[PDB]
Structure formats: C-alpha cells, structure tokens
C-alpha cells in the first residue's frame, strides 16, 4: 500500500511524462530493448529495427509507446484502485502477448531510468521510492490476475 504522499509524488512526476508521452515512450522502449534485447523479440512488430535512429523514426513504435504509457497512466491515477483497468491488460498480456513478470520488471527499470534522466529535480530518492512502490504494486496485482487466467508470470 502507498501513502497519500507517495501517490502524490508518483502523480507529480507522471504529469511531467504527460508533457511528452510519445517521447517518453520512445526513450523507455529504446532503453528496454538495449538493456534486454529479448524484450525486442516479444515486440514481433519491431524486432527488425536495427539502430536507435530507426527506432526513433518508427511512427508505429512511437504510437505503441503512447498506447502503453496511456494505459499505465490511467492505472497510476487510480492510486491502487485499478482492478477494472488492470484486468483487460492482464488478459491480453497473459493470453496473447505472453509477457512474463520479469519483463515487467525490465520495463519498470527502464521507466525509472528515463524518468530520472529527464526529470532529476522532480525524481529524487523519495519520488523514486514512491514510483518503485507503485510499479511493484502494478506487477504484483497483474501477476495475481495472470495466475487466475492460468500459466504463471
């Protein structure tokens, strides 16, 4: 459980993401793909992009990042009361994309990295701790929904 003050820090930095959702989503994917190339495999639509500049020039990848971050933002804004938003996400990611929980850890790391790279003055230790707790809650709750659908994270 997050305190009200922790949620406020999460949403404070999230408003900064919302000033440029597409750019943040591009940076998060590029970091994710570089740190963990097997995650680029899971994105079988983008597996073929060879360089950072090709990745940045992909309109489809940019649009996909906005779709992803929009769903995450909608979840974060519910401050843990996110069953209705999380359930369809768990359904698609368990039964179609087949994204293990470890890959959600990988993208959580990339989110933290990009947020600290772009917003260090609004993303110090306490804000990082709050965002880490909110992403941990997200991963814990989606893992439980994964199991309800069969097959483990």
Does 95 interact with ligand HEM (rule: CB under 6 A)? no
Which of 8, 35, 67, 117 binds ligand HEM (CB under 6 A)? It is 67
Distance between CA atoms of residues 110 and 104, nearest Å: 10
Query: Which of the residues 99 through 138 are near ligand HEM (CB under 6 A)?
Result: 99, 103-104, 107
- Give 83-92 contacts, CB < 8 A, sequence gap 24+: 83/141, 86/138, 86/141, 86/142, 86/145, 87/145, 89/142, 90/142, 90/145, 90/146, 90/149, 91/145, 91/149
The angle formed by the CA atoms of residues 47, 153 and 65, to the nearest 5 degrees, is 40
Q: What x/- string results for residues 7 through 46 when contact with ligand HEM is judged by CB under 6 A?
A: --------------------------------x--xx-x-
CB of 63 within 8 A of CB of 26? no
Which of 92, 95, 126, 129 binds ligand HEM (CB under 6 A)? It is 92
Q: Which stretch binds Mn ion (CB under 5 A): 2-10, 54-62, 67-75, 121-129?
A: 67-75
Least gap, CB of 13 to ligand HEM (angstroms)? 15
Which of 9, 89, 115, 127 binds ligand HEM (CB under 6 A)? It is 89
CB of 32 within 8 A of CB of 106? yes
Least gap, CB of 53 to ligand HEM (angstroms)? 21
The verdict on whether residue 29 carries a ligand-binding annotation is: no
User: By the criterion CB under 5 A, which residues form the site for Mn ion?
Assistant: 68
């Amino acid at each position: 459980v997050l305190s009200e003050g922790e949620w406020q820090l999460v949403l404070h930095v999230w408003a900064k993401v919302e000033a440029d959702v597409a750019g943040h989503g591009q940076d998060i994917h590029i970091r994710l793909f570089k740190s963990h190339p097997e995650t680029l495999e899971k994105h079988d639509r983008f597996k073929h992009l060879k360089t950072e500049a090709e990745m940045k020039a992909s309109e489809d990848l940019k649009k996909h990042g906005v779709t992803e971050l929009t769903a995450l933002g909608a979840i974060l804004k519910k401050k843990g009361h996110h069953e209705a938003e999380l359930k369809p996400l768990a359904q698609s990611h368990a039964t179609k994309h087949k994204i293990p929980i470890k890959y959600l850890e990988f993208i959580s790391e990339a989110i933290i990295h990009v947020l600290h790279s772009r917003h260090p003055g609004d993303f110090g230790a306490d804000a990082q701790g709050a965002m880490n707790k909110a992403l941990e809650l997200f991963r814990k709750d989606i893992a439980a929904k994964y199991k309800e659908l069969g097959y483990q994270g």
